[PDB]
Symmetry: C3
Subunit: 92 residues, 3 copies
């Protein structure tokens, strides 16, 4: 699995959540953060996604979050050594 | 070294922290995030040495479980290096 | 690229931000978190390889007070970073 961390504009959050839902991504968390390069409000989404589907998930976010202006944000794809589901204790 | 990111139910937070402290886990940070029709969750971020990875994961898994959908997940992330600001000590 | 996650004292934040800016490290996000509880500020900064040490040093120098609880700096391997404005990788 990989961990996707995306920093997007607040005004694009609904488009992004919609695109993720249509791309079949359901499990995620998000929070408000302040960003720079004078700080601007941003929304940080964190999504665990298995390798075959990292590319499609990143694409949905890129398409939905873009405005074309400086300050659109970034998407980080981090490696994950192990992931566990707390409901069952199982390593996913 | 690893960076453990755990998403747990707020009502399980106290039990989780108690279990971590008993497992000799010490410094960590936490914040509230919205996750999935979203629900509030507590996101813990814990830096640990290799010998503490298993004990930390085990503690959260036993303490945060309710068996119902939405219990959360635990991500164990690789860390290239970590620095303690006070002492300037670096661990890899 | 690497992703740097730093936990610093709120009273040292402006000093940390100034030091980063001076080091040419401008793109980042931050948020308030609770530590150990005591409020802390968490910075998340994606940087190219040559900027890892300059970023770590800027924070180490500006955030230290000498008292226990000054924070930590994590350097994480990042596999890919995309610039949303262009839809391109970096």
């Amino acid at each position: 699995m990989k961990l996707i961390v995306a920093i997007v504009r607040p005004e694009k959050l609904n488009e992004v959540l919609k695109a993720l839902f249509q791309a079949e991504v359901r499990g995620l968390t998000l929070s408000r953060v302040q960003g720079h390069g004078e700080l601007h409000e941003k929304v940080r989404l964190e999504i665990g996604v298995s390798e075959p589907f990292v590319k499609p998930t990143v694409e949905a976010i890129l398409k939905a979050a873009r405005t074309g202006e400086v300050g659109d944000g970034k998407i980080f794809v981090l490696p994950v050594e192990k992931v566990y589901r707390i409901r069952t204790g199982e390593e996913d």
